[PDB]
Amino acid sequence: MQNWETFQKKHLTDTRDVKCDAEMKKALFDCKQKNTFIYARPGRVQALCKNIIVSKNVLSTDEFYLSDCNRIKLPCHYKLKKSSNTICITCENKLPVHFVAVEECP
């Protein structure tokens, strides 16, 4: 949302088999149509954004696990997809805070 911490809770997860319906229904999202959750550690991701302090765009060199929820059929009936691919994020203050895109950064 604004800092790497808030961006962590909404775009990162601890369990690879997260529950889209049980997590999205939470007030944090409020049954959001779709969301892109990642599967990694805070120290493994911090080292990826511990190269720049100013605002810049960084693209992961290696592929990371990606658990995303997508609106397949309203209301809160969503699906979970797991795929390892690179991601484009905005680095700031030695930490990432925004999700730009995947292999292609618009």
User: What radius of gyration, in Å, describes the C-alpha atoms of the chain?
Assistant: 14
Residue of 4, 8, 11, 92 marked catalytic: 11
- CATH code (residue 29): 3.10.130.10
What method did the depositors use to determine the structure? NMR
Per-residue b or e along 27-43, where b marks 16 or more CB atoms closer than 10 Å to that residue's CB: eebebbeebbbbbbeee
Cβ atoms of 23 and 17 within 8 Å: the answer is no
Kindly report the backbone phi and psi dihedral angles of residue 103, in degrees, each rounded to the nearest multiple of 5, phi listed first: -45, -30
Instruction: Report how many domains make up the chain.
Output: 1
| DSSP per residue, 85-99 | E--EEEEETTEEEEE
Host domain of residue 12: 1-106
Known catalytic membership, residue 77: no
Cβ atoms of 44 and 14 within 8 Å: the answer is no
What gap in Å lies between CA 26 and CA 9, rounded to an integer? 12
Q: What is the DSSP letter of 6?
A: H
According to DSSP, the β-strands at 56-59 and 88-92 are: antiparallel
According to DSSP, the β-strands at 35-39 and 64-73 are: antiparallel
Known catalytic membership, residue 98: yes
According to DSSP, the β-strands at 35-39 and 12-13 are: parallel
| DSSP per residue, 24-64 | HTSTTTSS-S-EEEEE--HHHHHTTS-S-SSSEEEE-SS-E
User: CB burial class (10 A; 0-12, 13-18, 19+) of residue 52?
Assistant: middle
Residue of 59, 98, 99, 101 marked catalytic: 98
